[PDB]
């Protein structure tokens, strides 16, 4: 959205002769240059995106209720890892408290 | 009990006794017999035909879509969204790879940017070329550009659909729809193809 | 257990029309059914 | 040891031929005429049998194993 400089209100976007013009309730009118060429957007599979589980994946090595697995961590050589299974495709991620995380992330 | 196969406590008897229409059926099914008796003997032939008849709408192949107020000219540098300004690199390749698919002269100020779900394209076995033909055969009032079909992870496949001016000339006498309204109506038609 | 091992290595590829979760659940339900051999120890412990 | 090695090989072949049962490596679904696909070299009597004619199982798999590997890795990410 575009915020009015004068009154900091949400300006109304209309389209005139091949240009996006924002007009406010206080009469201030501005035209967006490049960053306002986004009428609408949607994101699918929001329930299994990587940005969904960033906090959870970060906290997984410290949560005591997560399933562990007997595998060596290649960074700290700890002999156990934390195994999580996220998404409808059952993506398996192995995480450790040292910062190691399978899938290279 | 799951959606589409709900045969839990009384539902199907209620669908029969109440004469509920087909739109209200939670467990509708159908049995199809192959035309050739020789084909029905072989399981693989019946297996590929079964996967042939399965509604894969264009929406479910999309991870995210963006509606942009942009027009495309091959020579003139029109304004482009800054987060998607890198798309021009594969636009030049498309123009030199299709000497017959040149941009029209009546492209409107409306762009739909599509980022295909490459995982769904693999599991459902749907090629990029098949999607392009299906959309161009159903929507003659649009101009469609696409990136290269890549086999390397990390680089997505981008579908770009440009609305022509005739998309609004369909019915603009009904002035109770701004050009933003028709464009939103068009993208709903594209996704449900 | 070996179905889980296939899941860990990413060796479970679901067919067309099934997600990996739904195919994994289908495999587990099939693999956790008593065979017809279960009555062999049962019938050996009883006198009909 | 023999049991587990043979099981590994057989399970790998079974997974490969269950993935490419109707899915075609050349894109889309299989186009079957004269009992053979036209896009690839798949035969009908190989999808469910890997023992009677092992050589024809060790050739088709040797043709698209790589492409199979990249697709398997791609599905198991993000
Ligand atoms: Zn204002
Ligand atoms: Zn570690
Ligand atoms: Zn084929």
UniProtKB/TrEMBL annotation, chain A:
<protein>
    <submittedName>
        <fullName>C122R</fullName>
    </submittedName>
</protein>
TrEMBL record, chain C:
<comment type="function">
    <text>Catalytic component of the DNA-directed RNA polymerase (RNAP) that catalyzes the transcription in the cytoplasm of viral DNA into RNA using the four ribonucleoside triphosphates as substrates. Forms the polymerase active center together with RPB2. Part of the core element with the central large cleft, the clamp element that moves to open and close the cleft and the jaws that are thought to grab the incoming DNA template.</text>
</comment>
<comment type="function">
    <text>DNA-dependent RNA polymerase catalyzes the transcription of DNA into RNA using the four ribonucleoside triphosphates as substrates.</text>
</comment>
<comment type="similarity">
    <text>Belongs to the RNA polymerase beta' chain family.</text>
</comment>
<protein>
    <recommendedName>
        <fullName>DNA-directed RNA polymerase subunit</fullName>
    </recommendedName>
</protein>
<comment type="subunit">
    <text>Part of the viral DNA-directed RNA polymerase that consists of 8 polII-like subunits (RPB1, RPB2, RPB3, RPB5, RPB6, RPB7, RPB9, RPB10), a capping enzyme and a termination factor.</text>
</comment>
TrEMBL record, chain D:
<protein>
    <submittedName>
        <fullName>M1249L</fullName>
    </submittedName>
</protein>
């Amino acid at each position: 959205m575009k915020i009015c400089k004068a009154c900091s209100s949400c300006m109304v976007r209309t389209y005139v002769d091949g240009n996006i013009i924002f007009r406010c309730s206080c009469g201030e009118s501005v035209q967006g240059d490049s960053q306002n060429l986004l009428v609408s957007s949607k994101v699918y599979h929001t329930g299994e995106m990587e940005d969904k589980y960033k906090i959870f994946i970060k906290n997984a090595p410290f949560d005591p209720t997560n399933c562990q697995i007997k595998k060596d961590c290649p960074n700290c050589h700890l002999d156990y890892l934390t195994q999580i299974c996220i998404g409808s495709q059952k993506i398996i991620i192995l995480v450790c408290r040292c910062g190691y995380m399978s899938n290279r992330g | 009990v799951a959606g589409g196969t709900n045969k839990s406590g009384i539902v199907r008897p209620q669908e029969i006794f109440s004469a509920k229409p087909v739109e209200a059926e939670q467990s509708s099914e159908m049995l199809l017999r192959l035309k050739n008796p020789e084909v029905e003997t072989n399981k693989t032939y019946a297996q590929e035909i079964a996967n042939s008849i399965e509604l894969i709408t264009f929406e479910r192949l999309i991870l995210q879509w963006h509606l942009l107020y942009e027009t495309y000219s091959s020579t003139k540098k029109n304004v482009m969204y800054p987060d998607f300004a890198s798309d021009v690199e594969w636009m030049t390749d498309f123009l030199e790879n299709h000497p017959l698919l040149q941009p029209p002269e009546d492209i409107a100020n409306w762009c739909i940017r599509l980022e295909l779900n490459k995982t769904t394209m693999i599991l459902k076995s749907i090629s990029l070329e098949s999607i392009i033909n299906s959309l161009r055969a159903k929507h003659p009032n649009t101009y469609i550009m696409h990136s290269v079909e890549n086999t390397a992870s990390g680089i997505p496949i981008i579908i770009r659909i440009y609305l022509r001016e005739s998309a609004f000339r369909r019915s603009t006498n009904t002035r109770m729809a701004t050009d933003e309204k028709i464009a939103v109506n068009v993208v709903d038609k594209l996704l449900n193809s | 257990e070996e179905i889980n091992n296939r899941l860990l290595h990413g060796d479970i590829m679901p067919p067309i029309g099934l997600t990996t979760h739904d195919f994994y659940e289908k495999l587990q339900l099939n693999a956790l059914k008593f065979p017809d051999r279960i009555l062999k120890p049962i019938m050996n412990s009883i006198n009909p | 040891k023999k049991v587990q090695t043979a099981l590994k090989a057989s399970l790998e072949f079974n997974t490969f031929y269950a993935f490419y049962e109707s899915r075609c490596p050349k894109g889309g679904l299989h186009d079957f005429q004269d009992k053979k696909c036209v896009k690839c070299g798949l035969f009908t009597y190989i999808i469910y049998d890997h023992l009677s004619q092992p050589e024809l199982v060790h050739d088709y798999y040797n043709n698209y194993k790589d492409q199979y590997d990249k697709e398997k890795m791609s599905i198991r990410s993000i």
